[PDB]
């Protein structure tokens, strides 16, 4: 009985392969060969937000494109005024082992989580002037790896226990739970319209989730090893994924298959962030080799190299205005590049 | 042979053996120090992240200034003490050496006391001072180098000694010999600090039986031989200067002819501090198996 | 295990039946979006000090 | 601007507070703690932090065994630990694969391991009833406490390959206070080694 | 709730001395600044003194500098104003005003109840109108002007608007001349630029009767306008 189900699943996967291959009437390069390159896109260090005591593990940009929140295993989530380097808040964490953070679109809330298996929703605009935990969201069986806000109330989270979940910070309960990965769900990225999101798992597969259905919609694959970071293309019809296999791939949602593979024989180090620029021409991948390598997303070749860290980069958040790209790193210096 | 300075009778010699013997020795020391310490500075500049590296940086820079200054010693002695460049080069030269030698000695002592705190009191907060604190303490030690020898710029020179113009401070005569008193002190007291630190570090390592590892056993050898090379380089010059003061005190004046051999020995053996300048890069450049 | 595999194959069918478009159309749409908005990205184009807040 | 200047004052107050907290934290020593299930750790839901003080040091021990996830994805957090305390239930000896994995992990080639063989008395009594061949068929020697203990001790240390680290094996009967002294002096040797490394001399 | 209460008022002989204290509760007093603002018995507000967080910086009004001294006991959540050589002009009700400064912060957001104390080159702020009779349902307008342009080069314009209801302490309504204060209805709206500012009230209700003071924060000492009475 079980063997019949396994055979039918194999037949279904074969049909997936056949249908995906039939639609591949061209490659991205075969069309983009008529397009001129961006040339040498050199970028330089404008500022350097010093002040973390240890390795920085996450950074996120406020929707106003000025405040940036950084989280480090020193146990402090500090909010930076990026135009003046002034530190605005120094939030003490209940545990030092933070691995992700998020800045709410309204700017009212700052999320934080890590090996605690608990996601803390800090409230910034408290009447008493201090910043205090609003909720301590709990229920994952493993470390919360990445979290993002859809609005001030409901936060989506991704955890090492092969699950992504959608919370309500108004009640602390899960409104919906997403399951289906085999490995740890290392990273997550919400689409620009927040109607749906993608997550990359340590089983080298990336999935498309629908927050209102509560179920998967499409599944993507193609890296040899775990996906470390993932981010939507700003048009909402594609997303880039960066694996530990020292390559970044661009997956089209409507074409249901990988379109391009950014890699270079000099590279052996794993990816750690795959954020785009606002026009989508530039994919500012960040590498464990201490460098951020800007790939021209359509010509599929290197546009430039950004360097300066004495240790691996942990984030490559691009401002919502496209004005600057921040790069936190394990040497505690969150440089601002523009 | 006579020279008069500060209304005091003094004696000076110009025996040809100086230009026969010194220039080859100081030239070999110049070659060794220039190559080794130049490559060390090159590494440190384009190939600092720690306070001990900051102290080694200060030592290497002082040695770099001194090695850059030696070719004027070359000229001076190939000229047989006929200092053609005159007043300002003479006084600037004399400071430069004085300041750079002392600085090299005091850093070396500071590196040894650093290793002391790093190995006998490993947890002590002095091991945790930031690079900025190292920079300010380096500036303070540089201030010590400057203030302890700044008088030598005020010393009037050069002095006509006959058919030549003498550029020198080590004139042999009784005076309030501040510079020569420093010369004595900079050996004896840093010798005490260096030897005390080295002895305590190798008795701390042996007491823990941690020399059971080969790398620690090599560390034992370095930490011991630093004092040995220091003594080999400086001891003969300072002990000869102590003789000079002994002979001046006992044998009296107006019979200077007998001191010629001992002055020859003094000048020729003094170049071992430059020999020290050649060998110092062993501390950092020619260092442990990371090198 | 049997019911779990049944759910797995049912999900595979539900994902298989989704609509799809030719890759040429997708790549053309991505290029059209990118080139339509190319003038408004301070990273791929240089920004003068008059506009740049990170001076 | 008379508004921005007060924000600048706020930034330099909280920067000072960050520096003071860092100075306070620098006195602690962070040790990772590992071992098999029920294997001696308890005698000596997420991360289980525990801490104690000895000779004015403030040791922090992390029992991370609660993480039901791949080591590879979170072990990089502990890259900065001073030492790894590894425990073995000697009365059992299946942990050798875990030791092999953790000793040569990409992040720990420079971090020394402290290795407590635990429940040694139960092992000695078991030797009077079962040969060491039962948990190690390859064993070739007499059935006695001292030789079997030395064998498994060398067997654990034989897993290291990198010369850049040391394994400080030790034995405990889980009925003595000597554990704190053993860890303190081992950590003191470890800190001296790290200091000599920092001087470019080790 | 956040609460501020001050004490130490009464009648003092001219030339005497008195200590006024401000007691805070329910908020992180150590991280807030504190100001003193005083009101003559039938006149608009006037500024007195400042003290920053952690006692780092202090400022005084020109009419007061040296006559008063301001200090705070952060662990006791108490601010002190020590006062000497009281002149006839020093009779006023004194309000304790909190403030906190960072990007996006709202200074002057909460005011104490005030203590009646009685005795036996700066930017000047001016309002073109003294009284405006108005009725509910209609819109209302109040306007204020400055001698110097408040729009600093960094883009902030530091005009502030306070509403004082009869028999009560002032409350913040508009800060930095465009932003709406926390907790105030949406009826109010600031506007203007440079040296002229306007506060617009849409669909007025009787709850908004009172005196509206414009204020600048571009430089110390801070200065209040004479106040426009929106009278029912
Ligand atoms: C200016 C030349 C004087 C010669 C004697 N002399 C000295 O007075 N100070 C020195 O530092 C030094 N080094 C060497 Cl070799 N000779 C030295």
- Cis-peptide into B158, omega within 30 deg: yes
| Number of structural domains found in chain D | 1
> In a mutational test of the pocket of ligand 1, which residue from B91, B93, B102, B170 has the highest number of ligand atoms less than 8 Å from its CB?
B170
Residue A161: strand, helix, or coil: coil
**Domain membership flag for residue D63:** yes
Distance separating alpha carbons of residues B21 and B18, to the nearest angstrom: 5
B169 touches ligand 1 (CB under 6 Å): yes
Distance B224 CA to ligand 1 centre (A): 30
End-to-end CA distance of chain B: 52
A47 near D CB under 8 A: no
Residues of D with CB under 8 A from a CB of A: 4, 7-8, 10-11, 14-15, 17-18, 21-22, 25, 45-47, 49, 64, 67-70, 73-74, 77, 79-80
Query: Residue A235: closest CA among chain C residues belongs to which residue?
Result: C33
Phi, psi (rounded to 5 degrees) for E112? -70, 180
Distance separating alpha carbons of residues D163 and B7, to the nearest angstrom: 68
What burial letters (b/e) apply to B7-32, b meaning 16+ CB within 10 Å?
eeebbbbbeeebeebbbeebbebbeb
**Domain membership flag for residue D2:** no
Find chains touching chain D: ≥3 CB pairs under 8 Å. Answer: A, B, E
Note whether B touches D: 3 CB pairs or more under 8 A.
yes
Q: Based on DSSP, count helices (H) and strands (E) in chain C, helices before strands.
A: 2, 0
Distance separating alpha carbons of residues E16 and E22, to the nearest angstrom: 20
Chain A residues near residue D8 by CB distance under 8 angstroms: 84, 86
Query: Residue A74: closest CA among chain D residues belongs to which residue?
Result: D22
B168 touches ligand 1 (CB under 6 Å): yes
Helix (H), strand (E), coil (C) string for chain B: CCEEECCEEEECCCCCHHHHHHHHHHHHHHHHHHHHHHHHHHHHHHCCCCHHHHHHHHHHHHHHHHHHHHHHHHHHHHCCCCCCCCHHHHHHHHHHHHHHHHHHHHHHHHHHHHHHHHHCCCCCHHHHCCHHHHHHHHHHHHHHHHHCCCHHHHCCCCEECCCCEECCCCCECCCCCHHHHHHHHHHHHHHHHHHHHHHHHHHHHHHCCHHHCHHHHHHHHHHHHHHHHHHHHHHHHHHHHHHHHHHHHHHCCCCHHHHHHHHHHHHHHHCHHHHHHHHCHHHHCCCCCCC
Q: Are strands E179-180 and E171-175 parallel, antiparallel or unpaired?
A: antiparallel
Cβ distance of A129 and E31 shorter than 8 Å: yes
The alpha carbon dihedral of B88, B89, B92, B93 has a sign of negative
Note whether D touches E: 3 CB pairs or more under 8 A.
yes
Give me the CATH number covering residue D101: 3.40.50.300
B12 touches ligand 1 (CB under 6 Å): no
Residues 6+ apart with CB under 8 A from E30: E53, E54, E74
Phi, psi (rounded to 5 degrees) for A142? -160, 175
Helices B51-78 and B17-46, packing angle to 10 deg:
150
Give me the CATH number covering residue A222: 2.130.10.10
All structural domains of chain C with their residue ranges: 2-54
The CATH-assigned architecture of domain C2-54 is: Irregular (4.10)
Query: Which CATH number applies to E125-231: 3.50.50.60, 2.60.200.20, 3.40.50.740, 2.60.40.10?
Result: 2.60.40.10
Bridge partners (DSSP) listed for residue A166: A156, A176
- Counting Cβ atoms within 10 Å, is residue E153 exposed (0-12), middle (13-18) or buried (19+)? exposed
Give the one of A12, A41, A235 whose C-beta lies nearest to C16's C-beta.
Answer: A12
Bridge partners (DSSP) listed for residue D58: D28
Query: Class of the E3-119 domain?
Result: mainly beta
Q: Which domain holds residue A129?
A: 1-338
Distance separating alpha carbons of residues A28 and A34, to the nearest angstrom: 11
- What does each C-alpha distance from B211 to B203, B214, B288, D164 come to in angstroms? 10, 7, 15, 16
> In a mutational test of the pocket of ligand 1, which residue from B73, B98, B180 has the highest number of ligand atoms less than 8 Å from its CB?
B73
Q: Are strands A334-337 and A45-49 parallel, antiparallel or unpaired?
A: antiparallel
- Give all domains of chain B, ordered by start, each with its CATH number: 3-284 (1.20.1070.10)
**Resolution of the PDB structure in angstroms:** 3.5
Distance B259 CA to ligand 1 centre (A): 18
E31, E53 in Cβ contact below 8 A?
yes
Distance separating alpha carbons of residues B119 and D188, to the nearest angstrom: 10
A186 near D CB under 8 A: yes
The CB density around residue A206, as the number of other CB atoms within 10 Å, is 26
B183, B239 in Cβ contact below 8 A?
no
Bridge partners (DSSP) listed for residue E162: E172, E213
Q: Which domain holds residue D80?
A: 28-190
Distance B42 CA to ligand 1 centre (A): 28
Chain D residues near residue A93 by CB distance under 8 angstroms: none
**Domain membership flag for residue D100:** yes
| Number of structural domains found in chain A | 1
Cβ distance of D6 and E218 shorter than 8 Å: no
**Angle, vertex CA B244, rays to CA B243 and CA B247, nearest 5:** 80
All structural domains of chain E with their residue ranges: 3-119, 125-231
Residue with the two structure tokens 């291959």 = A21
């Amino acid at each position: 009985e079980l063997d019949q189900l396994r055979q039918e699943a194999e037949q279904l996967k074969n049909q997936i392969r056949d249908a995906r291959k039939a639609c591949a009437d061209a490659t991205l390069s075969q069309i983009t060969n008529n397009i001129d390159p961006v040339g040498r896109i050199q970028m330089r260090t404008r500022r350097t937000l010093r002040g973390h005591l240890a390795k920085i593990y996450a950074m996120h940009w406020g929707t106003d494109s000025r405040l940036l929140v950084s989280a480090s295993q020193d146990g402090k989530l500090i909010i930076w005024d990026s135009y003046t380097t002034n530190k605005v808040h120094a939030i003490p964490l209940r545990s030092s082992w933070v691995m992700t953070c998020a800045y709410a679109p309204s700017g009212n809330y700052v999320a934080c989580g890590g090996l605690d298996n608990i996601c803390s929703i800090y409230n910034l605009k408290t009447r008493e002037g201090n910043v205090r935990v609003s909720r301590e969201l709990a229920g994952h069986t493993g470390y919360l790896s990445c979290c993002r806000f859809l609005d001030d109330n409901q936060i989506v989270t991704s955890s090492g226990d092969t699950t992504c979940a959608l919370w309500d910070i108004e009640t602390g309960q899960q409104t919906t739970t997403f399951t289906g990965h085999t490995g740890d769900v290392m990273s997550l990225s919400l689409a620009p319209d927040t109607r749906l999101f993608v997550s990359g798992a340590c089983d080298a597969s990336a999935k498309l989730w629908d927050v209102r259905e509560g179920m998967c919609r499409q599944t993507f694959t193609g890296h040899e090893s775990d996906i470390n970071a993932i981010c939507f293309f700003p048009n909402g019809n594609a997303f880039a994924t960066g694996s530990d296999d020292a390559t970044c791939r661009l997956f089209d949602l409507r074409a249901d298959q990988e379109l391009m593979t950014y890699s270079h024989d000099n590279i052996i180090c794993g990816i750690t962030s795959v954020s785009f620029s606002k026009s989508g021409r530039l994919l500012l991948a960040g590498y464990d080799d201490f460098n951020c390598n800007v790939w021209d997303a359509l010509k599929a070749d290197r546009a430039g190299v950004l360097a300066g860290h004495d240790n691996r980069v942990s984030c490559l958040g691009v401002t919502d205005d496209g004005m600057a790209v921040a790069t936190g790193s394990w040497d505690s210096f969150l440089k601002i590049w523009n | 042979h006579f020279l008069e300075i500060d209304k005091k009778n003094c004696c000076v010699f110009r025996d040809d053996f100086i230009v026969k013997v010194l220039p080859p020795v100081l030239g070999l020391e110049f070659i060794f120090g220039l190559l080794g310490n130049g490559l060390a500075l090159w590494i440190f500049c384009f190939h600092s992240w720690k306070s001990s590296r900051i102290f080694l940086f200060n030592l290497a820079v002082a040695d770099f200034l001194l090695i850059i200054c030696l070719p004027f010693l070359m000229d001076n002695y190939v000229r047989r003490w006929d200092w053609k460049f005159g007043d300002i080069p003479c006084r600037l030269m004399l400071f430069m050496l004085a300041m750079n030698r002392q600085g090299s000695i005091i850093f070396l002592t500071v590196v040894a006391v650093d290793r002391y705190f790093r190995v006998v009191h490993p947890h002590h907060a002095l091991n945790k001072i930031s690079n900025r604190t190292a920079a300010i303490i380096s500036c303070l030690l540089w201030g010590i180098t400057i203030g302890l020898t700044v008088h030598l710029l005020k010393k009037k020179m050069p002095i006509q000694n006959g058919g030549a113009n003498l550029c020198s401070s080590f004139s042999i005569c009784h005076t309030f010999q501040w510079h020569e008193a420093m010369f004595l002190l900079e050996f004896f007291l840093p010798l005490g600090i260096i030897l005390f630190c080295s002895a305590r570090i190798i008795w701390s390592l042996r007491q823990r039986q941690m020399d059971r590892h080969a790398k620690i056993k090599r560390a034992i050898t370095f930490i011991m031989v630093v004092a040995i090379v220091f003594v080999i380089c400086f001891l003969p010059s300072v002990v000869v200067r102590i003789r000079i003061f002994w002979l001046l005190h006992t044998s009296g004046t107006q019979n200077c002819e007998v001191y010629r051999s001992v002055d020859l020995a003094f000048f020729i053996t003094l170049s071992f501090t430059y020999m020290n300048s050649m060998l110092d890069p062993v501390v950092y450049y020619f260092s442990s198996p990371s090198f | 295990s049997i019911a779990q595999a049944r759910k797995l194959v049912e999900q595979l069918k539900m994902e298989a039946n989704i609509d799809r478009i030719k890759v040429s159309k997708a790549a053309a749409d991505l290029m059209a979006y990118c080139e339509a908005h190319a003038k408004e990205d301070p990273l791929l184009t240089p920004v003068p000090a008059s506009e740049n807040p990170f001076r | 601007s008379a508004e921005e200047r007060a924000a600048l004052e706020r930034s330099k107050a909280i920067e000072k507070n960050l520096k003071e907290d860092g100075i306070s934290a620098a006195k602690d020593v962070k040790l990772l703690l590992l071992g098999a299930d029920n294997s001696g750790k308890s005698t000596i839901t997420g991360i289980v932090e525990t801490h104690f003080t000895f000779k004015n040091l403030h040791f922090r021990l992390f029992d991370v065994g609660g993480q039901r996830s791949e080591r590879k994805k979170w072990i990089h957090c502990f890259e900065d630990v001073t030492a790894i305390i590894f425990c073995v239930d000697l009365s059992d000896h299946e942990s050798l694969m875990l030791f092999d994995s953790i000793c040569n992990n990409k992040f720990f080639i420079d971090t020394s391991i402290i290795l407590f063989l635990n429940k040694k008395d139960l092992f000695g009594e078991k030797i009077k009833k079962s040969p060491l061949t039962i948990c190690f068929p390859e064993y070739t020697g007499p059935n006695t406490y001292e030789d079997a203990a030395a064998y498994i001790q060398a067997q654990f240390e034989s897993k290291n390959r990198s010369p850049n680290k040391e394994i400080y094996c030790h034995m405990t009967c889980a009925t003595d206070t000597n554990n704190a002294q053993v860890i303190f002096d081992a950590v003191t040797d470890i800190i001296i080694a790290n200091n000599l490394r920092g001087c470019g001399l080790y | 709730d956040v609460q501020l209460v001050e004490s130490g008022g009464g009648l003092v002989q001219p030339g005497g001395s008195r200590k006024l204290s401000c007691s805070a509760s329910g908020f992180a007093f150590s991280s807030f600044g504190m100001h003193w603002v005083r009101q003559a018995p039938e006149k608009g507000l006037e500024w007195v003194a400042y003290i920053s967080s952690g006692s780092g910086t202090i400022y005084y009004a020109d009419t007061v500098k040296g006559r008063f001294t301001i200090s705070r006991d952060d662990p006791k959540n108490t601010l002190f104003l020590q006062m000497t050589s009281l002149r006839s002009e020093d009779t006023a009700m004194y309000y304790c005003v909190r403030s906190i400064y960072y990007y996006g912060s709202s200074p002057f957001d909460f005011w104490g109840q005030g203590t009646t104390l009685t005795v036996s080159s700066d930017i000047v702020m001016t309002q073109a109108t003294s009284s405006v009779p108005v009725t509910p349902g209609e819109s209302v307008s109040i306007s204020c002007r400055s001698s110097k342009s408040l729009l600093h080069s960094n883009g902030n314009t530091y005009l502030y608007w306070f509403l004082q209801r009869p028999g009560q302490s002032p409350q913040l309504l508009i800060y930095r001349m465009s932003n709406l204060a926390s907790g105030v209805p949406d009826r109010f709206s600031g506007s203007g630029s440079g040296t002229a500012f306007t506060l617009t009230i849409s669909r007025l209700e009787a709850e908004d009767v009172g005196v509206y003071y414009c204020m600048q924060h571009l430089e110390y000492p801070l200065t209040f306008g004479a106040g426009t009475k929106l009278e029912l």
